[PDB]
Coordinates of all heavy atoms in Angstrom, one line a residue:
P323 N 236.0 0.0 147.0 CA 236.4 -1.2 147.8 C 237.4 -0.8 148.9 O 237.8 0.3 149.0 CB 237.0 -2.1 146.8 CG 237.7 -1.1 145.8 CD 236.7 0.1 145.7
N324 N 237.8 -1.8 149.7 CA 238.8 -1.6 150.7 C 240.2 -1.9 150.2 O 241.2 -1.5 150.8 CB 238.6 -2.4 151.9 CG 237.2 -2.1 152.6 OD1 236.8 -1.0 152.7 ND2 236.5 -3.2 153.0
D325 N 240.3 -2.6 149.0 CA 241.6 -2.9 148.3 C 242.4 -1.6 148.1 O 242.0 -0.8 147.3 CB 241.3 -3.6 147.0 CG 242.6 -4.3 146.5 OD1 243.7 -4.1 147.1 OD2 242.5 -5.0 145.5
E326 N 243.5 -1.5 148.8 CA 244.4 -0.4 148.6 C 245.0 -0.3 147.2 O 245.3 0.7 146.6 CB 245.5 -0.3 149.6 CG 245.1 0.0 151.1 CD 244.7 1.5 151.2 OE1 245.0 2.3 150.4 OE2 244.0 1.8 152.2
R327 N 245.1 -1.5 146.6 CA 245.6 -1.6 145.2 C 244.6 -0.9 144.3 O 245.1 -0.3 143.3 CB 245.8 -3.1 144.8
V328 N 243.3 -1.0 144.6 CA 242.4 -0.3 143.7 C 242.3 1.2 144.2 O 242.2 2.1 143.3 CB 241.0 -0.9 143.8 CG1 239.9 -0.2 143.0 CG2 241.1 -2.4 143.4
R329 N 242.3 1.4 145.5 CA 242.1 2.8 146.0 C 243.3 3.7 145.6 O 243.2 4.9 145.4 CB 242.0 2.8 147.5 CG 240.7 2.2 148.0 CD 240.7 1.7 149.4 NE 240.5 2.8 150.4 CZ 239.4 3.1 150.9 NH1 238.3 2.4 150.6 NH2 239.3 4.1 151.8
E330 N 244.5 3.1 145.4 CA 245.6 3.8 144.8 C 245.4 4.1 143.3 O 245.6 5.2 142.9 CB 246.9 3.0 145.0 CG 247.9 3.7 145.9 CD 248.4 5.1 145.4 OE1 249.0 5.1 144.3 OE2 248.1 6.1 146.1
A331 N 245.0 3.1 142.6 CA 244.8 3.3 141.1 C 243.6 4.2 140.8 O 243.9 5.2 140.2 CB 244.6 1.9 140.5
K332 N 242.4 3.8 141.2 CA 241.2 4.6 140.8 C 240.5 5.1 142.0 O 239.4 5.6 141.8 CB 240.3 3.7 140.0
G333 N 241.1 5.1 143.2 CA 240.4 5.6 144.3 C 239.3 4.6 144.8 O 239.3 3.5 144.4
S334 N 238.4 5.1 145.7 CA 237.3 4.3 146.1 C 236.0 5.1 145.9 O 236.0 6.4 145.8 CB 237.4 4.0 147.7 OG 237.5 5.2 148.4
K335 N 234.9 4.4 145.7 CA 233.6 5.0 145.4 C 232.8 5.2 146.6 O 232.5 4.3 147.4 CB 232.9 4.2 144.4 CG 231.7 4.9 143.7 CD 230.8 3.9 143.0 CE 231.6 3.2 141.9 NZ 230.7 2.4 141.0
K336 N 232.4 6.5 147.0 CA 231.6 6.8 148.1 C 230.1 6.9 147.6 O 229.8 7.9 146.9 CB 232.1 8.1 148.7 CG 233.6 8.2 148.9 CD 234.0 8.4 150.3 CE 235.4 8.9 150.4 NZ 235.6 10.3 149.8
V337 N 229.3 6.1 148.1 CA 227.9 5.9 147.6 C 227.0 6.4 148.7 O 226.9 5.8 149.8 CB 227.6 4.5 147.2 CG1 226.2 4.4 146.6 CG2 228.6 4.1 146.1
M338 N 226.2 7.5 148.5 CA 225.3 8.0 149.5 C 223.9 7.5 149.2 O 223.4 7.7 148.1 CB 225.3 9.5 149.4 CG 226.7 10.1 149.4 SD 227.6 10.1 151.0 CE 229.0 9.0 150.6
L339 N 223.3 6.8 150.2 CA 221.9 6.2 150.0 C 220.9 7.3 150.5 O 220.7 7.5 151.7 CB 221.9 5.0 150.8 CG 222.9 3.9 150.5 CD1 222.9 2.8 151.6 CD2 222.7 3.4 149.1
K340 N 220.3 7.9 149.5 CA 219.4 9.1 149.8 C 218.1 8.6 150.5 O 217.7 9.2 151.4 CB 219.1 9.8 148.5 CG 218.3 11.1 148.7 CD 218.0 11.8 147.4 CE 217.2 13.1 147.6 NZ 216.8 13.8 146.4
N341 N 217.5 7.6 149.9 CA 216.2 7.2 150.5 C 216.3 6.5 151.8 O 215.4 6.5 152.6 CB 215.4 6.3 149.5 CG 216.2 5.0 149.1 OD1 217.4 5.1 149.1 ND2 215.5 3.9 148.9
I342 N 217.5 5.9 152.2 CA 217.7 5.4 153.5 C 217.9 6.6 154.5 O 217.4 6.6 155.6 CB 219.0 4.5 153.5 CG1 218.9 3.4 152.5 CG2 219.2 3.9 154.9 CD1 217.7 2.5 152.6
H343 N 218.5 7.7 154.0 CA 218.5 8.9 154.8 C 217.1 9.5 155.0 O 216.7 9.9 156.1 CB 219.3 10.0 154.1 CG 220.8 9.9 154.3 ND1 221.6 9.0 153.7 CD2 221.6 10.7 155.1 CE1 222.8 9.1 154.1 NE2 222.9 10.1 154.9
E344 N 216.2 9.4 154.0 CA 214.8 9.8 154.1 C 214.1 9.0 155.2 O 213.3 9.5 156.0 CB 214.1 9.8 152.8 CG 214.5 10.8 151.8 CD 214.0 10.6 150.4 OE1 213.7 9.5 150.1 OE2 214.0 11.6 149.6
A345 N 214.3 7.7 155.2 CA 213.7 6.8 156.2 C 214.2 7.2 157.6 O 213.4 7.4 158.5 CB 213.9 5.4 155.9
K346 N 215.5 7.3 157.7 CA 216.0 7.6 159.1 C 215.6 9.0 159.6 O 215.4 9.2 160.8 CB 217.6 7.4 159.0 CG 218.0 6.0 158.8 CD 219.2 5.6 159.7 CE 220.0 4.5 159.1 NZ 220.8 3.7 160.1
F347 N 215.5 9.9 158.6 CA 215.1 11.3 159.0 C 213.7 11.3 159.5 O 213.4 12.0 160.5 CB 215.3 12.3 157.9 CG 214.9 13.7 158.2 CD1 215.8 14.6 158.6 CD2 213.6 14.1 158.0 CE1 215.5 15.9 158.9 CE2 213.2 15.4 158.3 CZ 214.2 16.3 158.7
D348 N 212.8 10.6 158.9 CA 211.4 10.6 159.2 C 211.1 9.8 160.5 O 210.3 10.2 161.3 CB 210.5 10.1 158.1 CG 210.6 11.1 156.9 OD1 210.8 12.3 157.1 OD2 210.4 10.6 155.7
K349 N 211.8 8.6 160.6 CA 211.5 7.7 161.7 C 212.4 8.0 163.0 O 211.9 7.7 164.1 CB 211.8 6.3 161.3 CG 211.1 5.9 160.0 CD 209.7 5.4 160.2 CE 209.0 5.2 158.9 NZ 207.6 4.8 159.0
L350 N 213.5 8.7 162.8 CA 214.4 8.8 163.9 C 214.9 10.2 164.2 O 214.6 10.7 165.3 CB 215.7 7.9 163.7 CG 215.4 6.5 163.4 CD1 216.6 5.7 162.8 CD2 214.9 5.8 164.7
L351 N 215.5 10.9 163.2 CA 216.0 12.2 163.5 C 214.9 13.2 163.8 O 215.1 14.1 164.7 CB 216.9 12.6 162.3 CG 217.6 14.0 162.5 CD1 218.4 14.0 163.9 CD2 218.5 14.3 161.4
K352 N 213.8 13.2 163.1 CA 212.7 14.1 163.4 C 212.1 13.8 164.8 O 212.0 14.8 165.5 CB 211.7 14.0 162.3 CG 211.5 15.3 161.5 CD 210.9 16.4 162.3 CE 210.8 17.7 161.6 NZ 210.3 18.8 162.5
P353 N 211.8 12.6 165.1 CA 211.3 12.4 166.5 C 212.2 12.8 167.6 O 211.8 13.3 168.7 CB 210.9 10.9 166.5 CG 210.6 10.6 165.1 CD 211.6 11.4 164.3
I354 N 213.5 12.5 167.3 CA 214.6 12.9 168.4 C 214.7 14.3 168.5 O 214.7 14.9 169.6 CB 215.9 12.2 168.0 CG1 215.9 10.7 168.2 CG2 217.1 12.9 168.8 CD1 217.1 10.0 167.6
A355 N 214.7 15.1 167.4 CA 214.8 16.5 167.4 C 213.6 17.1 168.1 O 213.7 18.2 168.8 CB 214.9 17.1 166.0
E356 N 212.4 16.5 168.0 CA 211.2 17.0 168.7 C 211.3 16.9 170.2 O 210.7 17.7 170.9 CB 210.0 16.2 168.2 CG 209.6 16.5 166.8 CD 208.5 15.5 166.3 OE1 207.8 14.9 167.1 OE2 208.4 15.3 165.1
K357 N 212.1 16.0 170.7 CA 212.3 15.8 172.1 C 213.5 16.5 172.7 O 213.4 16.8 173.9 CB 212.3 14.3 172.5 CG 211.3 13.4 171.8 CD 211.1 12.1 172.6 CE 210.3 12.3 173.8 NZ 208.9 12.8 173.5
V358 N 214.5 16.8 171.9 CA 215.7 17.3 172.5 C 215.9 18.8 172.3 O 216.6 19.5 173.1 CB 217.0 16.6 171.8 CG1 216.9 15.1 172.1 CG2 217.0 16.9 170.3
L359 N 215.2 19.4 171.3 CA 215.3 20.8 171.0 C 214.2 21.7 171.5 O 213.1 21.2 171.8 CB 215.4 21.0 169.5 CG 216.7 20.4 168.8 CD1 216.5 20.5 167.3 CD2 217.9 21.3 169.2
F360 N 214.5 23.0 171.7 CA 213.4 23.9 171.9 C 212.6 24.1 170.7 O 213.0 23.9 169.6 CB 214.1 25.3 172.3 CG 214.7 25.3 173.7 CD1 216.0 25.1 173.9 CD2 213.9 25.6 174.8 CE1 216.6 25.1 175.2 CE2 214.4 25.6 176.1 CZ 215.8 25.4 176.2
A361 N 211.3 24.4 171.0 CA 210.3 24.5 169.8 C 210.8 25.6 168.8 O 210.5 25.4 167.6 CB 209.0 24.9 170.4
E362 N 211.4 26.6 169.3 CA 211.8 27.7 168.3 C 212.9 27.3 167.3 O 213.0 27.9 166.3 CB 212.3 29.0 169.1 CG 213.1 28.6 170.3 CD 212.3 28.4 171.6 OE1 211.1 28.4 171.5 OE2 212.9 28.4 172.7
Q363 N 213.7 26.2 167.7 CA 214.7 25.7 166.8 C 214.3 24.5 166.0 O 215.1 24.1 165.1 CB 216.0 25.5 167.6 CG 216.6 26.8 168.1 CD 218.0 26.5 168.7 OE1 218.5 25.4 168.9 NE2 218.8 27.6 168.9
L364 N 213.2 23.8 166.4 CA 212.8 22.6 165.7 C 212.6 22.8 164.2 O 213.0 21.9 163.5 CB 211.5 22.1 166.4 CG 211.1 20.7 165.8 CD1 212.1 19.6 166.2 CD2 209.7 20.4 166.4

């Protein structure tokens, strides 16, 4: 949470959304890399 009272006591929880990354990689990062990079580094 954003509550500093909680973040002091037990910290905050960082949650990584794996399948949202998979969607963004396939729909966005891969097509962008295809247009911005040289073929040898793609």
Side-chain angles (χ1 to χ4, degrees), residues 323-326 328-331 333-364:
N324 301 321
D325 193 354
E326 290 288 345
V328 178
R329 292 157 83 94
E330 246 298 299
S334 57
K335 193 191 303 186
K336 316 235 197 68
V337 181
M338 315 285 119
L339 303 170
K340 185 180 181 183
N341 57 327
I342 308 301
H343 278 76
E344 287 168 340
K346 294 223 205 202
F347 180 92
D348 294 332
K349 311 274 171 180
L350 302 167
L351 185 52
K352 244 293 176 185
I354 287 170
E356 290 169 26
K357 312 201 77 62
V358 300
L359 290 169
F360 287 95
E362 40 271 9
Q363 293 190 347
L364 187 66

